[PDB]
Design a protein around this nucleic acid. Structure first.
Ligand code: MG
Ligand code: MG
Ligand code: MG
Length: 106
RNA sequence: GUGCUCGCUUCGGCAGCACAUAUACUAAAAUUGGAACGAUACAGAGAAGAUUAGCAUGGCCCCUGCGCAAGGAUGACACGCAAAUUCGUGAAGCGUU
């Protein structure tokens, strides 16, 4: 059982160290990136997760589910205009992926 | 500072002219931090039973070496409840238009 925010920040230190180490190990396949972004969005610290998805798109910008998770995080957390920018950049850089167009017109 | 002035004009002073023209990470310091093995306890060396040669691979890990040699335990680390987009059948019971 966790007390006040010192032990909470220690738990966050251990988890972020584990995820950043997994990123340093692999630097490829996005399951580490997505899991670390989901863990950061689950604690309502979504600016960390915005940075995570931007780093992961710097790694691999042609991976369409990464775009889908980043835009559905920004739709889910009521940040409409962020997600709107994300879908516009998505349909600009990947114009043949119909997933982005269907979800953005939806 | 020195020299020259048919300078006052004595050997005292003054005037003029000429040459000579910008050192220093400015400390004999005050400070400010990160650091020496190595001792203290703990700690024990990969490969699916055991005993073991190793060669790699990757990078916000270094050490020895002049080394693009070779060593450092195969130098160490890497060991992960390894889940990424997107579902449908058939009957059976219950309530409903
Ligand atoms: Mg070697
Ligand atoms: Mg050996
Ligand atoms: Mg090696």
């Amino acid at each position: 059982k966790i007390t006040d925010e010192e032990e909470l920040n220690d738990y966050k230190l251990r988890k972020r160290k584990t995820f950043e180490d997994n990123i340093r190990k692999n630097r490829t396949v996005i399951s580490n990136w997505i899991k670390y972004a989901q863990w950061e969005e689950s604690l309502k610290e979504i600016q960390r997760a915005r940075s995570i998805y931007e780093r992961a798109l710097d790694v691999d910008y042609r991976n369409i589910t990464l775009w889908l998770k980043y835009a559905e995080m920004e739709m889910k957390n009521r940040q409409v205009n962020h997600a709107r920018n994300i879908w516009d950049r998505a349909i600009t850089t990947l114009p043949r992926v119909n997933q982005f167009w269907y979800k953005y017109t939806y």
